[PDB]
Design a protein around this ligand. Structure first.
Ligand SMILES: [K+]
Ligand SMILES: [K+]
Ligand SMILES: [K+]
Ligand SMILES: [K+]
Ligand SMILES: [Mg+2]
Ligand SMILES: [Mg+2]
Ligand SMILES: [Mg+2]
Ligand SMILES: [Mg+2]
Ligand SMILES: [Mg+2]
Ligand SMILES: [Mg+2]
Ligand SMILES: [Mg+2]
Ligand SMILES: [Mg+2]
Ligand SMILES: [Mg+2]
Ligand SMILES: [Mg+2]
Ligand SMILES: [Mg+2]
Ligand SMILES: [Mg+2]
Ligand SMILES: [Mg+2]
Ligand SMILES: [Mg+2]
Ligand SMILES: [Mg+2]
Ligand SMILES: [Mg+2]
Ligand SMILES: [Mg+2]
Ligand SMILES: [Mg+2]
Ligand SMILES: [Mg+2]
Ligand SMILES: [Mg+2]
Ligand SMILES: [Mg+2]
Ligand SMILES: [Mg+2]
Ligand SMILES: [Mg+2]
Ligand SMILES: [Mg+2]
Ligand SMILES: [Mg+2]
Ligand SMILES: [Mg+2]
Ligand SMILES: [Mg+2]
Ligand SMILES: [Mg+2]
Ligand SMILES: [Mg+2]
Ligand SMILES: [Mg+2]
Ligand SMILES: [Mg+2]
Ligand SMILES: [Mg+2]
Ligand SMILES: [Mg+2]
Ligand SMILES: [Mg+2]
Ligand SMILES: [Mg+2]
Lengths: 312, 172, 132, 6, 129, 208
RNA sequence: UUUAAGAACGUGUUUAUUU
RNA sequence: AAACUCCAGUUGACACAAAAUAGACUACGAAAGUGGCUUUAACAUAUCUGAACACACAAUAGCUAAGACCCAAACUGGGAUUAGAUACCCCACUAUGCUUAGCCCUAAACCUCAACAGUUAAAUCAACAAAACUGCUCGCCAGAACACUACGAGCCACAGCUUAAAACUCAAAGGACCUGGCGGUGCUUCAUAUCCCUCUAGAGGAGCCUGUUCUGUAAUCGAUAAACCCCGAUCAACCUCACCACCUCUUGCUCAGCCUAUAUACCGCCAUCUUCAGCAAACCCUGAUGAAGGCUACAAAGUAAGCGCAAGUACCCACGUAAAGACGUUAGGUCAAGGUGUAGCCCAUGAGGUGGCAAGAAAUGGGCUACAUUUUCUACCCCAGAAAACUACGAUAGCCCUUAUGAAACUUAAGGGUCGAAGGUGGAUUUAGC
């Protein structure tokens, strides 16, 4: 337990220690934000522990100590709330207010938004909640929206909705560059297993590819490997129109092709339309393949295989 | 009290008994008001009222309960199943359903007179009704139709021979 | 079951310290190292002699300050120096602490042939992380 | 188990 | 559940309390653990419906008699008044009767609260002079 | 797998994206709009958008590979296609005027038809009933019978009866026989059909 | 209503300032 | 399978046998018992209880005598199953089940709840069952077993029924419940490399390497169903080393020592269920204050610290793999890592030196290499040329030689030469993998 007087004494130690920490580092105590405290505590008390919640921290007591409910009865002993003896005066005072607004409507007559999660509702109510209790409250809110809710009602419902940052699965085009001669090209990078490739694709060419200074058909004797190099250009009907100059390092025979295929495709996205770039994405030409070799375990012959098991 | 360790079971039972307390009425603060005879499940307890100085002649468990209540003198005989938990649940049951002298007068609106051999024929008024005293007497009954106990009748007739009754024991 | 450096749960009446409450799989995630030197770094030498010195120091100080250590030691090496940092209790008299600081600092300097310094931090009672 | 036989 | 809103409003208007929701075990007998050791339990409980939703006596009727709290109850023809201190035999189903009970208890309580403020003011005024 | 359940399999079809919007149905149009949001797996090296890609021949090659040696398995596949091609040209030049109109020289058309002539219609399942096993006829799914045809062709060639005979010449000989509804692989299919007819009364032993 | 399907030695497992 | 095949099916003729539906009715009779149709006769007592001194009845089975015979059927025979099958399954047939005349007189003859009268309030009430009691009367029972037995007596009963003890023996037997476990226990939903089916490569066959078991030797110990078997050992030519033989020392490298007994005295570090999700302090309540138990969300007594899971962190993320994984279970492993309780040795169960054993008739686990043509050799590191069945494919084996390490090598390793064996894809069975 931490009282209100105790918290008030912690607020005074942070303010004083916040002025000392600026005197150490030579900063202005006035314009000393919390971002500068975290940077100065990491220089003076360097900890490389992987868990960031186990490193030295000097924050504001309102962010360290958990929020605690105020006292619910006075000296005489009478509680301050009429729903006290329920044990959930905050949860039921909310359900009573919502159900009272649904009676008024009957009388006188989303992409970014997401319903508040359970763990985020307890903080608002400072109450411990079950799962089935969370669902009941969500059912009234949805029922409130269907009805012709007034302006004041919308503001209430928006206290229990949280915005969502919708990511965009749209490839990032590379900036087209120009060489000394004036030819346009675009550079990208690919990675397959341990192979890493840098590809330079010229805007105009006669379908020539050179890997590490060697023509592609000599560097890749196997037909399968050359098929991979052809896949990006064939899909967009651009065979015999560009000149590629790449450099692949590491990996093996087939891993270097997939690494080159990916770089050529990424750099080929600058000389094509957006609709084609989306098609290349839906075909698996712009995605880095995460399948890498798995480690062997002790007590096993391989990553997943086991030693021969004898029952008797 | 129930628990895995014996020291933890003593606390639960002790601290939980004060919240289930009875109040037992006593005649002159040394014994009960009348003879009690009940049966809790299979366990029979037949307590009797006795005068001062008789002492406690009852089951060792009842001796320990009575001292807690404050009953100095009373006789009790346990029969049937001697189970410490039914013996206790029945003892507290009969000691709470006993009718005092004041309730009896109020019930019948008559004087409760005490007759003692030591005080001769003197009638001692122990309780009188608070309300209107009835003017008519109780109809005298030629023969009462009250169920008797062969154990008590066999003793009054000098027929209950036992080499274990009326033994010299320590003070209780 | 695994047992190394684990304090088995109990009814809830057993106090434990922070270091004593975390197992070996937390040594670089929620704990640090009680000894800090260069022996165990790549290309470095004399990791075996620095270990025998540590084992002896933790026992010398446990029997030199009997019943006074509140938590494990923290050995630190900066070149030739050897810094012993200890958390001790406040039962013993300061007169006797100053005696043992000078007796140990001196005895260990002549044994290991290095300047040795001892840093005490008194606490009223053994700090408790939680109760198991 | 049942005793061994000779 | 039909009259849960009406009752919660009455308690708020008359500065009193209400418990119309699911009654968790130990709200009275084990209160100090749920709320706190210095909690103050009710001195009077008023049952507008002595039954639960499965047509059985409310657990509070028995838990109140354990904690020595007097109970007032509106018992219908299918209820048990044995443990209710001041029972009131009357209909507990129709809405036209529930509004009456609430209106009567809301008034009797509001009067007494104001009746004491007049008695105290007189004593305080008379006491000084 | 290192992919999450959110990742979706890619569509290498090249003529699907080219479809005009006017042809897109209400349901199909919705599908295309959805894929923009979803994540996509990386296309594997096996399949490309080429015009000569044959999924049936890529699967048969994978069933012949041994120890991850795809360069050698694919080498044997093309040699067989070339050997089947040369044998038909030799039979086409030495044929009569009207016999050359019924001689197929495309090895792919021969490979697909040979495997289709080996697919069994029904199979057998050992059902344990009364401490005994029974060969109960069962309708095989479309995939099962396609896999059995491949496995039987590869198993017959791998037989030891053939001595110092290379796989491309063995497989090519079987494909022609099957293409003509001859050879042992077909007999293996007929034997399965003859054992299911004798055990036809045991069909009731099946519950599914 | 739907095959068969045996056997497993004897004891021991809970209190009180220089000068 | 046997049996039948003067069998089967349709139709017609055709009972001394047995009595669908109605019956979801609940009646008759003292009980036993009685369910097709009709007719005759007929179902005691104007208070109750009342015969184990009598009388009359009493399912089925069974005895005696004479008849009938569709079907069923003990017994028996045959077929099958099984380690055996005097049984369960199939076929056939007999006593018997039916009628008539007599006997026999038993039953879980149990609705295990006596007859007549009456009550529903009080203490309703051990538990379970089919709620708890009063009055009156008769009958019956007094620890278990010996014993529905022996003797005696009675009976149309003769291997019988009825009535019915004792000696020796035991300290329990018995009735009803809580919890858990188990079930060749039911219903439903599932398993995802997992149970079945289904996919891929293997093991079990040969040779070699290596461990173990047996045997052998003067010559370690330990692990040794799952959860041992290239395990303690990321390691034994001397050393290591604790074993054997021989010899030697005695306050002994140690303010001694012991790889001596006890892992069924333990710490320490672990295996296992765990490829689980539960453990549980402290309070409350239910069961009449019993062992115990504690949920229904349109909510019916549960609230719960803490541990674990989860969450976090590590590796290339949000995935996956690691790590983690409680309380307990197997007195599971280890006194030979070290430490240590109890016990034991102290001219020896301690210490040191020299030398030496660690093998194979035999069986088996694991692995390696192969039996070849998707192969073998060379170049190359993927557009080649040759080889291809008694000079092929195929030993890391044997033999010989050389070298490396070391004080020490028929012994360890490496290489060369020589040698060219089994083996022709492997029985029942069996392992791993998304
Ligand atoms: K019965
Ligand atoms: K094999
Ligand atoms: K083998
Ligand atoms: K093997
Ligand atoms: Mg592998
Ligand atoms: Mg583990
Ligand atoms: Mg009502
Ligand atoms: Mg036997
Ligand atoms: Mg047994
Ligand atoms: Mg009579
Ligand atoms: Mg009789
Ligand atoms: Mg009879
Ligand atoms: Mg007969
Ligand atoms: Mg017959
Ligand atoms: Mg037979
Ligand atoms: Mg017959
Ligand atoms: Mg019969
Ligand atoms: Mg009967
Ligand atoms: Mg009877
Ligand atoms: Mg009678
Ligand atoms: Mg007896
Ligand atoms: Mg009998
Ligand atoms: Mg007899
Ligand atoms: Mg006789
Ligand atoms: Mg051994
Ligand atoms: Mg052993
Ligand atoms: Mg052992
Ligand atoms: Mg192993
Ligand atoms: Mg040796
Ligand atoms: Mg030696
Ligand atoms: Mg020794
Ligand atoms: Mg032993
Ligand atoms: Mg053990
Ligand atoms: Mg793990
Ligand atoms: Mg976890
Ligand atoms: Mg053991
Ligand atoms: Mg050769
Ligand atoms: Mg050799
Ligand atoms: Mg040499």
């Amino acid at each position: 337990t931490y009282t209100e007087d105790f918290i008030k004494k912690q607020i005074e130690e942070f303010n004083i220690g916040k002025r000392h920490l600026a005197n150490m580092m030579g900063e202005d105590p006035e314009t000393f934000t919390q971002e500068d405290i975290d940077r100065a505590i990491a220089y003076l008390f360097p900890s490389g522990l992987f868990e960031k919640r186990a490193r030295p921290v000097m924050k504001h007591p309102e962010q360290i100590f958990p929020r605690q409910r105020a006292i619910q009865w006075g000296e005489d002993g009478r509680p301050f709330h009429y729903l006290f003896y329920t044990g959930k005066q905050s949860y039921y005072s909310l359900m009573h207010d919502v159900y009272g607004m649904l009676l008024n409507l009957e009388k006188h007559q989303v992409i970014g938004s997401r319903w508040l999660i359970k763990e985020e509702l307890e903080e608002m109510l400072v109450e411990k909640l079950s799962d089935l209790d969370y669902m009941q409250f969500i059912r009234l809110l949805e029922k409130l929206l269907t009805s012709q809710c007034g302006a004041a009602e919308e503001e209430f419902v928006q206290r229990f909705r949280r915005s969502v940052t919708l990511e965009s699965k749209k490839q990032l085009i590379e900036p087209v560059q120009y060489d000394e001669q004036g030819m346009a090209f675009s550079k990208s990078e690919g990675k397959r297993k341990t192979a890493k490739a840098e590809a330079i694709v010229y805007k105009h060419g006669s379908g020539r590819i050179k890997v590490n200074g060697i023509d592609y058909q000599l560097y890749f004797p196997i037909t399968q490997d050359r098929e991979q190099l052809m896949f990006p250009f064939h899909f967009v009907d651009r065979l015999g129109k560009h000149d590629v100059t790449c450099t692949v390092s590491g990996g093996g025979r087939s891993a270097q092709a997939g690494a080159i295929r990916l770089a050529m495709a990424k750099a080929l996205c600058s000389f094509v339309t957006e609709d084609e770039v989306e098609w290349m994405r839906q075909a698996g030409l712009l995605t880095t393949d995460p399948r890498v070799r798995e480690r062997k375990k002790p007590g096993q012959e391989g990553a997943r295989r086991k030693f021969t098991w004898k029952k008797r | 009290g129930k628990a895995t360790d014996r020291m933890d079971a003593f606390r639960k039972a002790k601290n939980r008994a004060v919240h289930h307390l009875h109040y037992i009425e006593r005649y002159e603060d040394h014994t009960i008001f009348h003879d009690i005879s009940l049966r809790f499940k299979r366990t029979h307890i037949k307590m009797k009222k006795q005068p001062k100085g008789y002492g406690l002649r009852c089951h060792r468990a009842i001796i320990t309960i009575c001292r807690l209540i404050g009953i100095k003198d009373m006789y009790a005989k346990v029969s049937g199943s001697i189970n410490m938990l039914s013996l206790t649940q029945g003892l507290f049951r009969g000691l709470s359903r006993q009718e005092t002298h004041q309730q009896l007068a109020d019930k019948k609106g008559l004087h409760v007179v005490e007759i003692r051999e030591e005080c001769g024929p003197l009638p001692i008024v122990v309780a009188s009704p608070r309300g209107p005293l009835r003017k008519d007497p109780e109809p005298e009954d030629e023969v009462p139709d009250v169920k008797l106990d062969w154990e008590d009748v066999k003793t009054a007739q000098g027929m209950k021979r036992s080499v274990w009754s009326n033994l010299k024991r320590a003070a209780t | 079951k695994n047992r190394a450096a684990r304090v088995r749960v109990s009814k809830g009446d057993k106090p434990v310290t922070y270091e004593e409450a975390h197992a070996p799989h937390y040594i670089a995630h929620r704990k640090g190292w009680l000894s800090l030197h260069t022996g165990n770094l790549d290309g470095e030498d004399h990791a075996a002699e620095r270990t025998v010195e540590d084992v002896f120091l933790r026992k010398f100080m446990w029997g030199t300050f009997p019943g006074c250590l509140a938590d494990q030691l923290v050995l630190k090496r900066r070149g030739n120096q050897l810094e012993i940092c200890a958390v001790v209790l406040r039962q013993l008299s300061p007169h006797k602490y100053y005696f043992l600081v000078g007796y140990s600092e001196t005895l260990l300097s002549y044994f290991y042939k290095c300047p040795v310094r001892l840093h005490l931090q008194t606490v009223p009672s053994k700090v408790v992380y939680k109760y198991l | 188990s049942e005793p061994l036989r000779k | 559940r039909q009259f849960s809103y009406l009752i919660e409003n009455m308690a708020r208007d008359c500065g009193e309390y209400a418990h119309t929701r699911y009654f968790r075990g130990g709200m009275l007998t084990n209160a100090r653990l749920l709320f706190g050791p210095t909690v103050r339990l009710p001195d009077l409980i008023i049952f507008l419906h002595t039954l639960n939703n499965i047509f059985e006596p409310h657990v509070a009727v028995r838990d109140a008699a354990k904690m020595n709290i007097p109970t007032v109850g509106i018992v219908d023809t299918n209820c048990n008044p044995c443990l209710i201190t001041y029972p009131v035999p009357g209909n507990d189903d129709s809405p036209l009767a529930v509004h009456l009970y609430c209106r009567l208890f809301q008034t009797a309580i509001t009067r007494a609260k104001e009746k004491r403020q007049q008695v105290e003011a007189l004593y305080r005024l008379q006491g000084q002079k | 797998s290192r992919y999450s359940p959110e990742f979706k399999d890619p569509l290498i079809d090249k003529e699907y994206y080219r479809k005009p919007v006017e042809e897109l149905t209400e349901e199909e149009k919705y599908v295309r709009e959805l894929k923009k949001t979803q994540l996509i797996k990386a296309a594997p090296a096996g399949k490309t958008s080429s015009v000569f890609e044959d999924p049936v021949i890529s699967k048969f090659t994978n069933m012949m590979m041994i120890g991850g040696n795809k360069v050698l398995a694919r080498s044997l596949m093309i040699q067989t296609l070339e050997a089947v091609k040369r044998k038909q040209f030799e039979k086409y030049h030495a044929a009569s005027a009207e016999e050359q109109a019924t001689i197929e020289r495309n090895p792919y058309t021969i490979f697909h038809q040979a495997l289709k002539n080996c697919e069994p219609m029904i199979g057998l399942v050992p059902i344990l009933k009364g401490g005994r096993f029974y060969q109960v006829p069962v309708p095989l799914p479309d995939r099962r019978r396609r896999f059995l045809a491949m496995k039987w062709m590869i198993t017959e060639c791998r037989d030891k009866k053939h001595q110092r005979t290379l796989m491309p010449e063995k497989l090519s000989h079987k494909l022609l026989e099957a293409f003509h509804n001859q050879g042992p692989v077909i007999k293996r299919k007929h034997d399965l059909h003859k054992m299911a007819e004798a055990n036809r009364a045991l069909a009731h032993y099946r519950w599914w």
